[PDB]
Design a protein around this ligand. Sequence first.
Ligand SMILES: O=C(O)[C@@]1(O)C[C@@H](O)[C@@H](O)[C@@H]([C@H](O)COP(=O)(O)O)O1
Ligand SMILES: O=C(O)[C@@]1(O)C[C@@H](O)[C@@H](O)[C@@H]([C@H](O)COP(=O)(O)O)O1
Ligand SMILES: O=C(O)[C@@]1(O)C[C@@H](O)[C@@H](O)[C@@H]([C@H](O)COP(=O)(O)O)O1
Ligand SMILES: O=C(O)[C@@]1(O)C[C@@H](O)[C@@H](O)[C@@H]([C@H](O)COP(=O)(O)O)O1
Lengths: 272, 272, 272, 272
Amino acid sequence: MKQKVVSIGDINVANDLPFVLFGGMNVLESRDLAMRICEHYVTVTQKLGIPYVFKASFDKANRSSIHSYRGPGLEEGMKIFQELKQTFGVKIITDVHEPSQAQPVADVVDVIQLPAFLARQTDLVEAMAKTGAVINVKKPQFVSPGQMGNIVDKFKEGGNEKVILCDRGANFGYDNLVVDMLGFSIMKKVSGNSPVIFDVTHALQRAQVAELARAGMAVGLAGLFIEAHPDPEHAKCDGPSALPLAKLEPFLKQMKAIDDLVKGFEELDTSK
Amino acid sequence: MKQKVVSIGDINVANDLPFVLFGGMNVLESRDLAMRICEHYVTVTQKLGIPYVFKASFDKANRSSIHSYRGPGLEEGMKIFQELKQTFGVKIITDVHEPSQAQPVADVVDVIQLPAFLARQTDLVEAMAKTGAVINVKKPQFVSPGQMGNIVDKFKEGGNEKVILCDRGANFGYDNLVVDMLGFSIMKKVSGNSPVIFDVTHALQRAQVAELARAGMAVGLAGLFIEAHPDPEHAKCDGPSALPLAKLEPFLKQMKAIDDLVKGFEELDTSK
Amino acid sequence: MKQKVVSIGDINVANDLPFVLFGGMNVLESRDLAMRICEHYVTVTQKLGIPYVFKASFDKANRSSIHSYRGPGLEEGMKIFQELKQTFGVKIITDVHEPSQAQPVADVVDVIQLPAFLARQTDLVEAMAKTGAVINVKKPQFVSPGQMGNIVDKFKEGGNEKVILCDRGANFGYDNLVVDMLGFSIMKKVSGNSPVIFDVTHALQRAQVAELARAGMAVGLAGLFIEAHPDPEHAKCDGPSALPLAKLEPFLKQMKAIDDLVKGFEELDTSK
Amino acid sequence: MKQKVVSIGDINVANDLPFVLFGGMNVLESRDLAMRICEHYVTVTQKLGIPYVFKASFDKANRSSIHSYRGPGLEEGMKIFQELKQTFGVKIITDVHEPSQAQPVADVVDVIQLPAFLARQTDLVEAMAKTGAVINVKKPQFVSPGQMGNIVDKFKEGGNEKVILCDRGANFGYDNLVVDMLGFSIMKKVSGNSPVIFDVTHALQRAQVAELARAGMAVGLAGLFIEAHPDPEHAKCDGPSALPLAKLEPFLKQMKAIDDLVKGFEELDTSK
Ligand SMILES: O=C(O)[C@@]1(O)C[C@@H](O)[C@@H](O)[C@@H]([C@H](O)COP(=O)(O)O)O1
Ligand SMILES: O=C(O)[C@@]1(O)C[C@@H](O)[C@@H](O)[C@@H]([C@H](O)COP(=O)(O)O)O1
Ligand SMILES: O=C(O)[C@@]1(O)C[C@@H](O)[C@@H](O)[C@@H]([C@H](O)COP(=O)(O)O)O1
Ligand SMILES: O=C(O)[C@@]1(O)C[C@@H](O)[C@@H](O)[C@@H]([C@H](O)COP(=O)(O)O)O1
């Protein structure tokens, strides 16, 4: 039973391969900040030996109040990714919201992303399926792991067969998320063993980021999705919960130690 | 403490007023069927004395497989509502999916509707807010009743202040829904007491439709949302679960008996 | 399909019969209070025409701190029920905790009760099964409605076949309960259609008691379990949540109106 | 912030110390089997360098049908532990059900255990508190991690201050459990940092035992509770789910690798 491999350039994403890191920032506040963020990851990844795909949103459709920060915009956001690609030579992953946006971004970026709230949006899927680019399907919090087959299916049909599945927890009563560590294996199975990744920061709507990321890693995964900010405190708002830049490295040491140890275990069968 | 009233033409929707019925069919399969469905409700409502707003989808974006029935289409769907309005003189409620669709439909119909998966879609909201038409916000299964304030808010700002909230249950573990009968009062409160309605057929993803609708009604509500099909059996698929046309009346008798009895109770305070 | 009838003296408990009320107080604080409580229910029931079975605990095993009020005791509690029986001529229902207590109480009372935390306690069940007295099995919050067959089974074997099932909600995330109005029918079915009753006050760990009891009643049930206190405010603590004595009647009017209306509906089949 | 240490003989249980293993069998079917089970763990633990406390039930109160295997009995069960202690020189942990049983077992065994269904049983707690022996409080599936303070409290009062907390997952909808990897830290905090252990086999009511135990371990814990059977297949029934004896070692290698790596990480603070 070998794992499906979805490559992003010279990068090979797969469940038995060492874990890739799709780290980054939430939104593209400004390039002076993007660059500073994207500067530390690269430095840290490069130094620790971990694949990496910077991530950032150039848009935000679920914000409260219309009189709020939508974001840079598709036309001004893509421009920002350009400069980073050159200056740093790393891949960029970003999410889209409308069917049309799909192709524009596909050119500019390496891994596009499908939002959870829109996971079941056939039109936007088919249109993201056209691009042929790599996809990251965030697993909705209201959907069971064994239902991720349909999404992957609908994508094969659209001609796209390069998909990654991202988990960010499941609803646990009102206003709360719990991560079912058992969902990863269920997702690998029904997904022709596509690559599974854990969005730890979004599964925590704290000093919890670490313990929870350790647990995810010990299961053995293809990737780890995260977000950080130089100053989480003052810039705290809501949505996810970012990691403190200055703790990137010491935290990523924890992951590799795990991911490496685990990724190299003699296959076990507690089945019989 | 009086209830907010949102009128749809000569119709006054409100939590203390007698319940309105936003019944109908799931999708607009064909007019030969739409008309037959819309024929029985009208006949039954009219005969039993219950307000009514036919409902039907001219589109479907969450279907499995691209090679599937999208639906009539916006351009050919609106045409269908025209003929029904004339032939029957009843209001039409239908859902939209993209920001642009909003105005087109607003002209053609009386009550537009915001899908749950898109409840938090600011752009589509602002654009639905423009129309100024009545709105029905389906309460996502992954959102708590006391969070329906933000949606109603984002709509006031968009200039729209004619909103109804629809509940279709909450996630209960994997692949399952439970209706928190307590969510209705929580929703009335944080909603400036806007009208609350129960989507019974969508809260049941059976011979259960009735018992569950009774319970909802006994709480005292503004409306009741439902769907029926002449032959549920053979045309069964998935999504919701339709009621059997031939049982409309005897089932709606149950509701009025409840809604009427309850809607006329001396306000009670178990508070103290 | 007729309902199973479990009689408690001249009382006939059954799902299609008018609803019985197993009201009362939480614990037996003092007789000066018990009597006052038991005085108002009787007066109200008798005046409104509703069967009734006073209820009270002579013991409490889940209290915090050993240095707390256990309760009157089995030996001094039973004495209290005696005086009430005479003075008022009503039935008494109370819960037991240890295998031995079963018989003692069976003599003194009419309906014994099995605590949820102990629902799966075979020894205490078999011993409660011996008595042959009527039983009330509180449905644990961590057990699904369709699992109530085993308990009823284990009781038939013990020779006891006079059982009532009581529902007090289900776990909904951390520290929270939701009542699945659909659980009642599932419980009737797997229970040879035994009598199902709704413990509204324990399903609410407020001004919510009413709306929630209405919903339960509209489903159509055998009974309604509740608790009240003269002054809920000052004597508030935790466990359940009692109703305000002075609101008993106006609240029970709500129930009969429902229970009566519903209990006399032409059987409906939304099944086909 | 140092961890509380609860010693069981020459054994020191604590959250920062290497993990102890409280492995064993479910019930005491027969000594010819107990001994064979207890033979392999010891051999494996001893060879791998992991503390160990054989575990087995001499009783079963939640079985279906009275006409079923209760178990050896308290009087004939304790006798079995005697022979194992001598023959193998390992500690024995077993659960009690009635207040009286407490002392008898305390003499015979090292770590007694409080069942979840009885976690909130004040009498049985106070009586288990008397013994003064080490306690293992299984965390009920219907209780939140931050409520484990009360139990630990009620035990201090009873004079007992040597307690371990065991987690076996939380209710996730009907008939299902999910393990909230975040519950361990919440439990350490409100417990004066008492020792936390993960009951993996009971959190799985499969080939899942491993992945789930890895995740638990990566969080960093005091212990690991498990059960195994020579032939899980044919002797499969219900309650928990046992591990396959022949896979003990290769599975415990996985744990130590984790527990060791993790237990020796430079304290991290993703807090700021
Ligand atoms: O907190 C997050 O995980 C994140 O920042 C990561 C982004 O890559 C993206 O998935 C985003 C989110 O949900 C995208 O848009 P939405 O699903 O309509 O709110 O959340
Ligand atoms: O089963 C339903 O309740 C229904 O037929 C009613 C429609 O009015 C509409 O709310 C529809 C649904 O969810 C709209 O589209 P989607 O939320 O993206 O799947 O479901
Ligand atoms: O609040 C309650 O519903 C009540 O007062 C009713 C009593 O009849 C009894 O069921 C009691 C309870 O749980 C009995 O004891 P325990 O289950 O071990 O806490 O709760
Ligand atoms: O599957 C289990 O984890 C186990 O075998 C372990 C035993 O140590 C004990 O905790 C037992 C259980 O629940 C004790 O009795 P009960 O809580 O009344 O069913 O379950």
